[PDB]
Design a binder for this molecule. Structure first.
Ligand SMILES: *CCC(=O)N(CCC(=O)Nc1ccnc(-n2ccnc2C)c1Br)c1ccnc(-n2ccnc2C)c1Br
Ligand SMILES: Nc1nc2c(ncn2[C@@H]2O[C@H](COP(=O)(O)OP(=O)(O)O)[C@@H](O)[C@H]2O)c(=O)[nH]1
Length: 167
């Protein structure tokens, strides 16, 4: 069966790990715990096709570190994550997208824009700003909450669909 290497990028604290832990381990915990189980693999069925998801979480890596460069060049698709209550994380998306484009030497890389923490009443980045940005990039935009599980599976499955359209 086909294996998809999905890379999760974005500023520290946007919820890249919480999104991964929900998808793979079925839970959310607010407290940071680095001793949690190291599973990043899940067998799943998307649009009838059975596949294996391998999630490469860039959290905890220094920017420009070797492991981060390795994750990016082996990754087939990218989730570009910002938090809806973190303006700077949204402004940083352009930087993460340009970096993926450089490391892949491609102007057409499968990507999904993810607006995380959509359970928060606290909102400094509007849906329209994110929809206009994803439209200019020609990529899907998905609103998620790693806390309530809203849009989580949709964001990773939409990325797999983007990889398939590309191939
Ligand atoms: C800038 C903040 C952090 O990056 N960070 C570390 C977060 C981290 O490494 N998370 C992470 C990376 C890769 N895999 C997993 N993971 C385990 C199981 N499944 C997955 C997806 C995870 Br959980 C961070 C966050 C919060 N606090 C701290 N911290 C503790 C003490 N001092 C500091 C700043 C850190 Br370093
Ligand atoms: N309210 C809320 N908090 C979240 C959500 N996702 C992550 N967080 C919290 O935001 C903090 C940072 O998340 P983390 O997954 O470690 O971010 P990362 O650095 O991008 O991997 C933690 O306290 C999480 O519990 C979410 O959807 N909603």
């Amino acid at each position: 069966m086909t294996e998809y290497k999905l890379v999760v990028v974005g500023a520290c604290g946007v919820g890249k790990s919480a999104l991964t832990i929900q998808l793979i381990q079925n839970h959310f915990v607010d407290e940071y715990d680095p001793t949690i189980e190291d599973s990043y693999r899940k067998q799943v069925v998307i649009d009838g096709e059975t596949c294996l998801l391998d999630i490469l979480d860039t959290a905890g890596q220094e920017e420009y570190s070797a492991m981060r460069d390795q994750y990016m060049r082996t990754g087939e698709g990218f989730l570009c994550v910002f938090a809806i209550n973190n303006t700077k994380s949204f402004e940083d998306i352009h930087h993460y997208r340009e970096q993926i484009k450089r490391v892949k030497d491609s102007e057409d890389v499968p990507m999904v824009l993810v607006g995380n923490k959509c359970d928060l009443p606290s909102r400094t980045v509007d849906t329209k700003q994110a929809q206009d940005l994803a439209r200019s990039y020609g990529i899907p935009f998905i609103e998620t909450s790693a806390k309530t599980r809203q849009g989580v599976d949709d964001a990773f499955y939409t990325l797999v669909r983007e990889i398939r359209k590309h191939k």
